């Protein structure tokens, strides 16, 4: 998700933002959580061919 990609950004490995989490500011909604799960399913392309 967008917060989960912001957490791995260079801005959150800096010193003043090292203990913080990007989920704390605006949490991801349930649609982008389930879209992250569905996209984690489909990074195997044979899974995508068989479900398509």
């Amino acid at each position: 998700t967008f917060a989960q990609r912001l957490n791995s950004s260079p801005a959150f490995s800096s010193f003043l933002l090292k203990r913080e989490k990007a989920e704390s500011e605006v949490p991801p909604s349930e649609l982008e959580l389930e879209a992250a799960q569905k996209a984690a399913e489909l990074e195997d392309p044979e899974v995508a061919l068989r479900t398509l």
Partner: protein, 102 residues
């Protein structure tokens, strides 16, 4: 499969930009993926029009703002229309959108 390379290049390039923009995408990867967009934006910076979209929505121009955005991304359809122009030149006709009233 005739024009799959262009559409899938557009899809992959924008998917990577949108996945990484404003988080960790470097400017070199943006200028690599989209060189002519960076060229046009650098024309606006070079020719003192760095606030041109700010000027356009300062004067309420919405259609000129959409035209500015569409003319800065007009080179995305350049591979397609060059391919279709060379197809119509291999078949002796002329490419349709290159004509004034046709």
């Amino acid at each position: 499969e005739e024009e799959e390379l262009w559409l899938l290049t557009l899809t992959q390039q924008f998917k990577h930009i949108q996945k990484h923009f404003g988080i960790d995408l470097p400017h070199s990867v943006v200028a690599h993926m989209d060189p002519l967009l960076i060229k046009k934006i650098d024309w606006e910076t070079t020719n003192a029009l760095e606030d041109f979209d700010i000027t356009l929505d300062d004067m309420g121009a919405e259609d000129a703002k959409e035209q500015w955005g569409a003319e800065n991304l007009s080179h995305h359809f350049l591979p397609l229309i060059r391919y279709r122009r060379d197809l119509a030149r291999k078949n002796g006709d002329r490419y349709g959108p290159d004509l004034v009233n046709g």
